[PDB]
Design a protein around this ligand. Structure first.
Ligand SMILES: Cc1cccn2nc(CCc3nc(-c4ccccc4)cn3C)nc12
Ligand SMILES: [Mg+2]
Ligand SMILES: [Zn+2]
Length: 312
């Protein structure tokens, strides 16, 4: 049914926008991804039967957790689409192929627990993955689906370009570990301020792509206020579920994961915007000027949380 799916003409104009919310169109998400692939890469860059088989298998490998779910995957993929479409020339055909697949697969098989939980509580996954625990597992899940019968969408590529594309994917998924973002953004800010940033430099390229992955991962802060607030509910519901497990183990979780400290959510968001989000989209807008609407919408939601704090 996915190969026969067609996108409504009204969605065609609105999908191009940075602030587009996929929320209301759940039944259309697989077809929306296909549409986005064809517009960014071309109508023939993947075999349609293999692509539709890959997408539905990716969908199946997302769990029914409050936040890191199938919806989040498509939301991140859409924000990447808008970035790629507004900056199409700066990126190669292979980068466009890998980054959209990576965004859809970046949280594959997420359990709803942070990398800290798995490490501190000696979860099997943290045994084989030292740093960026879940992120390395997400890439491992992506390869596993690719290596299934009739799912290998890169099979028509040469062995040179096959190993090239999954390196883009690997680096992109690992970059979604927020722990690595803070250092990455500082370096990119430095490279820009000194006027020494170069897109032909491959280490610079992986870093810009890295910041792009974060920008897409956090893009719920770039939607219209009501969507932004509603997503926050899903985020904390997952955090609080992790905090409850720590409480059953006797340990008090950090206030972010403590449902009894939910009064400090507005100030918690305020902190997240000023320390994480605003800096992320500021540096991205500097490097890629067409991405400005992301920073504009993030600033608008910042003042909204400021408006929440002062009881307005
Ligand atoms: C909006 C969004 C996107 C992606 C990821 N995240 N992660 C968050 C937690 C924000 C947060 N919330 C608290 C907090 C602290 C004490 C009490 C209640 C909340 C602290 N922080 C940093 N927001 C997001
Ligand atoms: Mg993740
Ligand atoms: Zn994510």
């Amino acid at each position: 049914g996915l190969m026969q799916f067609t996108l409504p003409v009204r969605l065609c104009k609105e999908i191009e926008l940075f602030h587009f919310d996929i929320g209301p169109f759940e039944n259309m998400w697989p077809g929306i991804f296909v549409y986005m692939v064809h517009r960014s890469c071309g109508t023939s860059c993947f075999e349609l039967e293999k692509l539709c088989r890959f997408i539905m298998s990716v969908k199946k490998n997302y769990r029914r957790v409050p936040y890191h779910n199938w919806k989040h995957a498509v939301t991140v993929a859409h924000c990447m689409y808008a970035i790629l479409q507004n900056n199409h020339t700066l990126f190669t055909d292979l980068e466009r192929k890998g980054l959209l697949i990576a965004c859809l697969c970046h949280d594959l098989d997420h359990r709803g627990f942070s990398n800290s939980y798995l490490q501190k509580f000696d979860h099997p996954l943290a045994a084989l993955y030292s740093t960026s625990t879940m992120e390395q597992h997400h890439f491992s899940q992506t390869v596993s689906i690719l290596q299934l019968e009739g799912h290998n969408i890169f099979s028509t590529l040469s062995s040179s370009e096959y190993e090239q594309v999954l390196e883009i994917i690997r680096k992109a998924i690992i970059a979604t570990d927020l722990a690595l973002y803070f250092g990455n953004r500082k370096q990119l800010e430095e490279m820009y301020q000194t006027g020494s940033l170069n897109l032909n430099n491959q280490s610079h390229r992986d870093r810009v792509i890295g910041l792009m992955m974060t920008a897409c991962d956090l893009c719920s802060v770039t939607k219209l206020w009501p969507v932004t607030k509603l997503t926050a509910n899903d985020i904390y519901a997952e955090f609080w579920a992790e905090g409850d497990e720590m409480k059953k183990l006797g340990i008090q979780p950090i206030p972010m994961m403590d449902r009894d400290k939910k009064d400090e959510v507005p100030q918690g968001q305020l902190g997240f915007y000023n320390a994480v989000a605003i800096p992320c989209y500021t540096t991205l807008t500097q490097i890629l000027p067409p991405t400005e609407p992301l920073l504009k919408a993030c600033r608008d939601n910042l003042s909204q949380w400021e408006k929440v704090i002062r009881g307005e």
